């Protein structure tokens, strides 16, 4: 409607250090969280009930992502590796080795035969899920890579970096197809394609989110009012109800904007530290949010629209 009405339903406690990332499983049943405590935890998406802990990394984890069938997770760690996990058994199926520094971000493609990763070593790597081998190393950026994401059919990858650039890569060739540059190039702390693949949402460390038309190469919308100068905060498109943009903020709030008019429609209060990560449920109007060291909780919020 005019505005959603997200209200706190559950607070999920259990990580002993900052939460780095939260993601809903594509089937809607689960939430996964990753933490600086080196753990992944699985929670019920609808009741917030703790399910299990998945362990194995030697250092903190910056990101987690689900496979399309909701059976696998990939995690990205400061230990310079990714791990692929069988969620039900908890087994580490593969350890993806090859980055020379912290691995910061990760995602499966829609077919889930590939994983993309970005690292502090300034490269983007494409991996084969079955063999666990690296297929390509792209010399993508001249500073740490902050996010990597496949488009809807897996043909393209978007990457962002502290070097101020967003780049679009051909998955099969590894060719850089596009570099997005605005009037200015502050660090880019997050990027993802819109669900329809026509747009890219990019966060920058000047308290600003930008919606780019991908093939026309131009910034169409801008979202402000939040605080984001230090951390790589996730952002989302919310599509189950009203069309929103959702993001954490360094003032401890979750911000929801009307995608089209660009106005703040709600600010969610409850966290006691930086909201680093938000996720939108695939079928219900539910948002998960997660905070840094002084808070350590995950919250599940639900709206009537």
């Amino acid at each position: 409607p005019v505005k959603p009405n997200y209200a706190l339903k559950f607070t999920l406690a259990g990580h002993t250090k900052a939460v780095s990332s939260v993601k809903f499983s594509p089937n809607g049943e689960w939430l996964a969280s990753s933490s600086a405590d080196k753990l992944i935890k699985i929670w019920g998406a609808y009741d917030g009930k703790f399910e299990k802990t998945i362990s194995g990394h030697k250092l903190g984890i910056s990101d987690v992502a689900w496979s399309s069938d909701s059976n696998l997770l990939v995690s990205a760690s400061d230990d310079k590796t990714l791990k692929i996990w069988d969620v039900s058994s908890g087994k580490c199926l593969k350890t993806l080795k090859g980055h020379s520094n912290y691995v910061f971000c990760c995602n499966f493609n829609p077919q889930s035969n590939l994983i993309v990763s970005g690292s502090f070593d300034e490269s983007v790597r494409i991996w084969d899920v079955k063999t666990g081998k690296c297929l390509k190393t792209l010399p993508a950026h001249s500073d740490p890579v902050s996010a990597v994401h496949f488009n809807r059919d897996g043909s393209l990858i978007v990457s962002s970096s502290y070097d101020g650039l967003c780049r679009i890569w051909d998955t099969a060739s590894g060719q850089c197809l596009k570099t997005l540059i605005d009037d200015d190039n502050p660090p880019v702390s997050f990027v993802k394609f819109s669900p329809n693949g026509k747009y890219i949402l990019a966060a920058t460390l000047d308290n600003t989110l930008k919606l780019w038309d991908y093939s026309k190469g131009k910034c169409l919308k801008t979202y402000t009012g939040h605080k984001n100068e230090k951390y790589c905060i996730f952002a989302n498109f919310s599509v189950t109800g009203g069309k929103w943009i959702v993001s954490g903020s360094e003032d401890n709030l979750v911000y929801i904007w009307n995608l089209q008019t660009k106005e703040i429609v709600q600010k969610l209060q409850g966290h006691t530290d930086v909201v680093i990560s938000t996720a939108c449920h695939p079928t219900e109007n539910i948002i998960a949010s997660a905070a840094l060291e002084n808070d350590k909780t995950i919250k599940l919020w639900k709206s009537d629209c």
Partner: peptide
């Protein structure tokens, strides 16, 4: 990590 304060 992403959380590094």
């Amino acid at each position: 990590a992403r959380t590094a304060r």
